[PDB]
Amino acid sequence: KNKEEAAEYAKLLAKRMKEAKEKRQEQIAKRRRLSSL
């Protein structure tokens, strides 16, 4: 159960980190857009 819980939390944390990185890239692109406009 320790192995299963660690694997599940690792997968969910990877998904959350990917979503946060996508949000940060969207904010960087919008910052570039407002710098160009």
Binding site: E5, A6, E8, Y9, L12, L13, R16
Partner: protein
């Protein structure tokens, strides 16, 4: 004194137990458990004065030692175990479930639920903790330590957990517009919608909650329990819906009921 107390007086008791004045000297002091002393309901008090199944204190003990009382999917044999807010009381023999929900006034009430409702439990998270090896930990209001929660769970949020496993199913954020419950003080058991949250550094924060008919009140942040996403509660609400109608409409509806009944 020289140690911890072990007795509780009848007059020196919380009023929401709603005991009488002359049948004894001592009150049922609740045992140590998940909930506090003031905001709890013992199994002896509930099973003797609320459901009227037993008559004396021996008979409710004979009920409890037959393993017929279930709390959160677990059999509790303690006669004075503290059953607090949204504790699921299940009877296998008679076949019904209960959820401890406050009504409009400052007291507990008998509120039967479906068995499909009696498989989960809403609970408020208290603090965010990081364990020994960088593992996250979560502390709820009923002291149920949850290992590996979602990173989006913050301090003042709420979660729905599964009773037979002990895992987080889904969660509701704490923001403006969410339906909430007040737990403690003068405003207790009122269902309302959060509209504002004032910030006071170094002291207790205060929020503003609006009722279902335009009424408004204010409580502290520690007395706030979110029960739903928006205007839809996640559980079944008791009769009255926590509206706190004042004494004039109570008198008018009592007169109307006495006229229609006779």
């Amino acid at each position: 004194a020289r140690g911890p107390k072990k007795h509780l007086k009848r007059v020196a008791a919380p009023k929401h137990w709603m005991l009488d004045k002359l049948t004894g000297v001592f009150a049922p002091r609740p045992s140590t458990g998940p909930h506090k002393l003031r905001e709890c309901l013992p199994l002896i008090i509930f099973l003797r004065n609320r459901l009227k199944y037993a008559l004396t204190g021996d008979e409710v003990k004979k009920i409890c030692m037959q393993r017929f009382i279930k709390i959160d999917g677990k059999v509790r044999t303690d006669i004075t175990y503290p059953a607090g807010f949204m504790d699921v009381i299940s009877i296998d023999k008679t076949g019904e479930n209960f959820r401890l929900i406050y009504d409009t006034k400052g007291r507990f009430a008998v509120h039967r639920i479906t068995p499909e409702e009696a498989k989960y439990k809403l609970c408020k998270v208290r603090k965010i903790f990081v364990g020994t090896k960088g593992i996250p930990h979560l502390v709820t209001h009923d002291a149920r330590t949850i290992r590996y929660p979602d990173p989006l769970i913050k301090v003042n949020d709420t979660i729905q957990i599964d009773l037979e496993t002990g895992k987080i199913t889904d969660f509701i954020k704490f923001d403006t517009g969410n339906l909430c419950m007040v737990t403690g003080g003068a405003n207790l058991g009122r269902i309302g919608v959060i509209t504002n949250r004032e910030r006071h550094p170094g002291s207790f924060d205060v929020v503003h909650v609006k009722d279902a008919n335009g009424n408004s009140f204010a409580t502290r942040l520690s007395n706030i329990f979110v029960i739903g996403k928006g205007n839809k509660p996640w559980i079944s609400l008791p009769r009255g819906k926590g509206i706190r109608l004042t004494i004039a409409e109570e008198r008018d509806k009592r007169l109307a009921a006495k006229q229609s009944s006779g």
